[PDB]
């Protein structure tokens, strides 16, 4: 979310704990956590995941403890901070299957595949 | 902190121009006893606006 933020991975190919090295989009953007794309290092990885430790690639935040605010004032708060790993050049999901809840805020462009694969929207 | 030159007796008086006391300019008179009192205060013989309110 912020820089120096550890996140869980929703998708399978992305592995375990990941850290946000940069908040992409914006000159001095401090905090971005709803549908935003963040540059990611892999701080710890299982070997079954395709990506490995020390590798930089993009991600999109899917779950935030801060939570989205709906238009009527509703706040959906998800426990845990989660990301879906994306390729640096393509920004397309590496993982074949997305796990856990997703929000309807991730309905734009390449995130349609994420909400298609993920069970609960 | 310190001054580089001594301030003048003139500038002392100009600073104390706005340091002056204010007169009372009015004293209310109670109806029952003729003593003048501070307005909305006890008359110092024990009367408010028209009645004896404290023994002392």
């Amino acid at each position: 979310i912020q820089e120096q933020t550890m996140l869980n991975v929703a998708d399978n190919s992305g592995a375990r704990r990941v850290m946000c090295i940069k908040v992409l989009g914006g000159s001095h953007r401090r905090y971005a956590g709803v549908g935003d794309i963040i540059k990611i290092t892999i701080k710890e990885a299982i070997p079954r995941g395709k990506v490995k430790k020390g590798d930089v690639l993009k991600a999109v935040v899917v779950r935030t403890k801060k939570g989205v605010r709906r238009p009527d004032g509703s706040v959906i708060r998800f426990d845990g901070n989660a990301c879906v790993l994306l390729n640096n050049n393509s920004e397309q999901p590496i993982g074949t299957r997305i796990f856990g809840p997703v929000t309807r805020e991730l309905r734009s462009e390449k995130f349609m595949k994420i909400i298609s694969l993920a069970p609960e929207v | 902190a310190v001054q580089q030159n001594k301030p003048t007796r003139s500038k002392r008086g100009m600073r104390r121009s706005h340091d002056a006391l204010t007169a009372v300019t009015s004293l209310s008179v109670d109806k029952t006893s003729g003593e003048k009192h501070l307005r909305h205060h006890i008359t110092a013989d024990g009367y408010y606006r028209g009645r004896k309110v404290i023994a002392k």
Partner: protein, 120 residues
């Protein structure tokens, strides 16, 4: 900042303020007229008047609540026996503040806060 905020600190902590107004309420109930400083009397209105409003209805729960907010059983007995019926008709305003002059040691605005139906 102080916007729509009640409560006068009077340069003391909350425990001292509570203890001071408990003792002042006890003295005001006991003697029916006391001399205080003026803000002290003004917040003394706010502690003393709900005690008589509680003391209008006499029950063991209300005497226990009055003992909680005074810790003086003589004051509880006076509130529920001598006063209470006296102020039963009065819809608030048991306290009257009469401003006196100024204190000698410190120039403090002085006041006499008294019960309205004082026998003297």
């Amino acid at each position: 900042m102080r916007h729509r905020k009640s409560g006068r600190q009077l340069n003391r902590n909350s425990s001292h303020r509570q203890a001071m107004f408990r003792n002042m309420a006890g003295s005001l109930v006991r003697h029916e007229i006391i001399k205080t400083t003026l803000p002290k009397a003004k917040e003394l209105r706010r502690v003393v008047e709900p005690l008589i409003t509680l003391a209008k209805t006499d029950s063991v729960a209300n005497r226990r609540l009055a003992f909680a907010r005074t810790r003086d059983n003589e004051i509880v007995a006076k509130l529920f026996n001598e006063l209470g019926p006296r102020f039963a008709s009065r819809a608030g305003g048991y306290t009257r503040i009469l401003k006196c002059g100024f204190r000698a040691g410190d120039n403090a605005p002085m006041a006499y806060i008294e019960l309205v139906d004082r026998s003297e």
